[PDB]
């Protein structure tokens, strides 16, 4: 019935970055958290 | 390959200009 993942047969819909940050064509909340993860990583790197 | 329409048959073989021309002709007809 309803599932978190879309009911798509092509795994090209389920492709994901290695860190798990699919900020393109993804869910709104998924893109938000991916942007947060990228922001944390880059702020740590630039602070260093 | 064999049961495919000629457009698919020639698009699987790397000929892309011919495939585009055939598709344009088919959509015209």
């Amino acid at each position: 019935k309803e599932s978190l993942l879309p009911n798509s047969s092509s795994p090209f819909a389920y492709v994901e970055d290695y860190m798990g940050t699919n900020l393109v064509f993804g869910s709104p909340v998924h893109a938000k958290e991916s942007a947060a993860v990228w922001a944390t990583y880059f702020e740590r790197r630039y602070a260093s | 390959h064999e049961a495919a329409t000629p457009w698919m048959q020639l698009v699987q073989h790397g000929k892309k200009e011919e495939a585009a021309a055939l598709l344009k002709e088919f959509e015209q007809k």
Binding site: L5, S10, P11, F12, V15, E16, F25 | -
Partner: protein, 389 residues
């Protein structure tokens, strides 16, 4: 972005090929219906089919065993989780066994062979209300309009539509809604009465809604058609009855709720079995293992166990083994691509034949191995399919 475009393209292709496959199923069904309806006149059909209450004959003291069982003439209601007995009559292929009925191993051997020769099948059909007729009509017309728009927007999928039609025309073998499949391997019986269990979920794992259910029995004989052709059947349908979930009414009546009291838990099973529903002792045994601190039985957990499938099967999936159950979706997909357009009725009619053919003759195309399959489409491409291997 390119991956998303590819996924959208694949989804559109699947939709358009399914739309192209739709009419082949209807035309094949019409042809096989014509072939079936032109056949019963030559053959001998089943004259009468009735459904009776399950026999629970437990002879009391002073009662001899040779007395014939007593059964009800008819039942107007079929509970969603109860047992039933279906009675029919057929031709000489079973009167030969009725003759042979009147202590030897070879005698039982020949009796068993004669039993093996016969073949019966039982199915249930729900009458569709007019509201559901128009509700499905609007849905299907919306879907076909959407697929028309999909074809229009990209001037490429027309070629795939025509290719799919041609491929179906080259692959396909030349030639009132199904609710649930009952015992399919039922053979000819001495007393012509068969015991059936109606499951809460159908083959697709969904509950059966309110409606008038008709029991349709189709009889096969291997002497005429050894290939189990669906056209050659002896078809007879019984009178429509009402089916509903009696569990809420029964629980409300008994409890006058979330926690069944421990002291009154056991009489509830007796009340259910008196009302007609069957509750396995194993089911109650492990339902009583999840009680709370005081001892109350979780009613929702007990209901889930009762409507579960592990403890009691529907005598149709019971015949199928775990391997067939594991490879059934693959067989379904291959069947629907070999016969363009199909549904539960034809899949149930050809259920065990194709499964036995696949798990006996081939056994290798299906039954997925450990290195050519992917157990998770989002993980297989990375973990199990390393570029080295």
């Amino acid at each position: 972005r390119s991956a998303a475009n590819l996924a959208r393209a694949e989804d559109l292709i699947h939709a358009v090929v399914t739309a192209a496959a739709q009419p082949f199923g209807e035309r094949r069904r019409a042809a096989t219906r014509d072939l079936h309806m032109e056949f019963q006149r030559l053959a001998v059909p089943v004259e009468r089919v009735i459904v009776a209450n399950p026999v629970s004959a437990l002879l009391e003291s002073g009662a001899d065993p040779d007395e014939k069982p007593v059964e009800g003439e008819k039942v107007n209601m079929w509970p969603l989780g109860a047992k039933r007995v279906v009675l029919y009559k057929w031709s000489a292929p079973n009167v030969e066994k009725l003759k042979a009925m009147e202590l030897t191993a070879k005698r039982l051997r020949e009796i068993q062979e004669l039993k093996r020769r016969g073949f019966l099948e039982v199915s249930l059909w729900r009458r569709v209300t007019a509201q559901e007729r128009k509700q499905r009509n609007e849905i299907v017309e919306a879907k076909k309009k959407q697929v028309e728009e999909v074809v229009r927007t990209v001037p490429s999928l027309a070629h795939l539509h025509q290719y799919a039609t041609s491929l179906y025309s080259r692959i396909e073998e030349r030639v009132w809604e199904f609710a649930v499949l009952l015992d399919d391997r039922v053979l000819l019986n001495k007393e012509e009465s068969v015991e059936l269990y109606l499951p809460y979920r159908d083959a697709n794992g969904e509950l059966l809604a309110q409606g008038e259910y008709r029991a349709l029995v189709r009889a096969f004989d291997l002497e005429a058609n050894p290939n189990l052709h669906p056209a050659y059947c002896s078809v007879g349908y019984s009178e429509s009855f009402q089916v509903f979930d009696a569990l809420p009414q029964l629980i409300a009546q008994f409890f006058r709720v979330t926690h069944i009291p421990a002291a009154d838990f056991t009489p509830f099973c007796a009340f259910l079995r008196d009302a007609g529903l069957d509750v396995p002792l194993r089911c109650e045994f492990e339902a009583g293992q999840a009680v709370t601190t005081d001892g109350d039985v979780y009613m929702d957990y007990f209901l889930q166990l009762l409507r579960g499938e592990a403890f009691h099967q529907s005598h149709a999936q019971a015949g199928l083994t775990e391997a067939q159950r594991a490879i059934e979706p693959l067989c379904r997909a291959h069947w629907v691509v070999h016969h363009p357009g199909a549904d539960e009725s034809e899949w149930a009619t050809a259920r065990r034949s194709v499964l036995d053919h696949a798990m006996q003759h081939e056994r290798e195309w299906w039954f997925p191995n450990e290195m050519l399959d992917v157990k998770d489409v989002v993980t297989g491409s990375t973990n199990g399919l390393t570029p080295q291997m």
